[PDB]
Write a protein that binds this ligand. Sequence first.
Ligand SMILES: CN(CC(=O)N1CCCCC1)S(C)(=O)=O
Length: 93
Amino acid sequence: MPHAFKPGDLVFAKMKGYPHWPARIDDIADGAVKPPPNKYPIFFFGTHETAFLGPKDLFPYDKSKDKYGKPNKRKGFNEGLWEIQNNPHASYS
Ligand SMILES: CN(CC(=O)N1CCCCC1)S(C)(=O)=O
């Protein structure tokens, strides 16, 4: 059965107005800003943006890739697909 989300989990993350987007659950570094309660820090591949999202917007990558893992014209998306497939745990700083 599934566990709660944890840092390093890979997902497609959904934001109003954007296609389901390759992303990961990030860690929070020592001394770094924490997310609000019930929210996770989501690192979006390709754009390298962070937003705070709850589970309703997080789709596990293995289950969802056949549906959501296809090229999109949006800035940074295809770069994102390469990152999530080829080096999802690297430093993108
Ligand atoms: C987090 N993204 C949306 C977003 O806030 N923005 C898009 C990038 C420029 C700033 C505004 S995403 C899903 O990576 O496209």
